[PDB]
Amino acid sequence: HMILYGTNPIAWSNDDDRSLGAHITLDQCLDEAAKIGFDGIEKGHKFPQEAAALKAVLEPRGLRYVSGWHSLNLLVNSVEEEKAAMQPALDLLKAMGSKVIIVCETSNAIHGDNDKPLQERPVLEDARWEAFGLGVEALAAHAAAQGITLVYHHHMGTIVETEDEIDRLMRFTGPHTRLLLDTGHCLFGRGNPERVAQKHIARVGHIHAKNIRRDIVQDVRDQNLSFLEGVRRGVFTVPGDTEGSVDFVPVLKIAAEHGYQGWLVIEAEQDPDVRNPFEYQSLGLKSLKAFAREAGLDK
């Protein structure tokens, strides 16, 4: 299949606040992801990191290793220091047959800081954008020569959150650097997911189909809450949730018309005690397959 459907384990156990879903084992997360019908799953903090041990848990379940998140520190480290820091993840992705590496500059990110409101998130100095993009494209070209496509995950609480900052990254990068379009983080950052698709679909190498609850997002803006406070309150949900705001079909229709191939990943951090991972991820996969069908992306 050219279009593959994945999930992300943070719907079961959160990476940034490990108390969320701490009670859910790796076995429960992988068992349920396989039963629901996902073709594969992305890396989470409970995952093994040796290729032989990671195959031992994913192959019996029929799950492919979609990719793994890898933090960048180009704002405080050199490019060479970051090529070294990135190589271990490239070795695992290659050994696992993965074609993509997910990256995001977190040196000064605040999404993992429970005490810091999202409005206090870092903004990259205007002068630094060109050098930062050159460091990103250098890492992208390093990975591409090893057969791995680099996709940058724009994220709340980081220097790349707004739609205009997604444009600036895409202007100061290329050709190997690709965008990971996360529809949840895009709309949360006041961007328009459909408009971002129109501009950058040709450079999109990975897609996260994440929904948002508009009422909860407005609470995070009015009360000036942190990123993780929002997650615990339900800022994110899955495609198909009536409480969501993201219009997925127009995004997938743009991807269909430009011949996108690769993964569509249901990613929805929530409090798993209140938002049962099996129920919401099940609704996400069903709804996202139907949306992709309606958009002409999956036939």
Quick one: 208 or 253, whose CB is closer to Co ion? 208
Distances from the Cα of 238 to the Cαs of 152, 209, 212, 278, 281, in angstroms? 21, 7, 8, 11, 7
- Starting at the earlier edge strand, list the strands of the sheet with 178-182: 64-65, 40-41, 3-7, 262-266, 204-209, 178-182, 149-153, 100-105, 69-72
Residues in the interface with Co ion (CB under 5 A) total: 3
CA distance 25 to 52: 19
For β-strands 40-41 and 262-266, DSSP reports them as unpaired
State which residue, 124 or 181, has the beta carbon closest to Co ion: 181
- 10: three-class secondary structure by DSSP: helix
What are the C-alpha distances in Å from 34 to residues 94, 281, 293? 22, 11, 21
Q: Does 42 bind Co ion (CB under 5 A)?
A: no
| Least Å from the CB of residue 89 to Co ion | 16
Question: Of 182, 194, 229, 298, which one interacts with Co ion (CB under 5 A)?
Answer: 182
Site for Co ion in 139-178 (CB under 5 A): none
Q: How far is the CB of 46 from Co ion (least distance, A)?
A: 15
Query: Segment near Co ion (CB under 5 A), from 59-67, 118-126, 203-211, 287-295?
Result: 203-211
* Residue closer to Co ion, measured from CB, 165 or 182: 182
Q: Which of residues 260-279 bind Co ion (CB under 5 A)?
A: 267
Q: Which stretch binds Co ion (CB under 5 A): 40-48, 205-213, 270-278, 279-287?
A: 205-213
Among 178, 208, 213, 233, binds Co ion (CB under 5 A): 208
Nearest distance, CB of residue 289 and Co ion, angstroms: 19
Q: In terms of CB distance, is 9 or 240 closer to Co ion? A: 9
Specify the stretch interacting with Co ion by CB under 5 A; choose among 41-49, 202-210, 213-221, 285-293.
202-210
Residue closer to Co ion by CB (options 55, 247) is: 247
Q: What does the DSSP assignment read for 213-266?
A: BHHHHHHHHHTT--HHHHHHHT-EE-TT-TTB---HHHHHHHHHHTT--EEEEE
> Which residues sit opposite 236 in a β-bridge?
212
- Which residues have a Cβ under 8 Å from the Cβ of 275 and sit 6 or more positions away? 234, 237
Pick the stretch among 123-131, 162-170, 181-189, 290-298 that binds Co ion (CB under 5 A): 181-189
For Co ion, the closer CB: 182 or 229: 182
Smallest distance, Co ion to C-beta of residue 60, A = 27
CB of 157 to Co ion, least distance (A): 9
**Cα–Cα distance, 242 to 136 (Å, whole number):** 37
DSSP character string of 125-171: -GGGHHHHHHHHHHHHHHHHTTT-EEEEE--TTSSS-SHHHHHHHHH
**Min CB(299)–Co ion separation in Å:** 26
Nearest residue (CB) to Co ion, 92 versus 268? 268
Least Å from the CB of residue 265 to Co ion: 7
Pairing of β 100-105 and β 149-153: parallel
- Closest approach of Cβ 56 to Co ion, in Å? 26
The residues that touch Co ion, with contacts defined as CB under 5 A, are 182, 208, 267
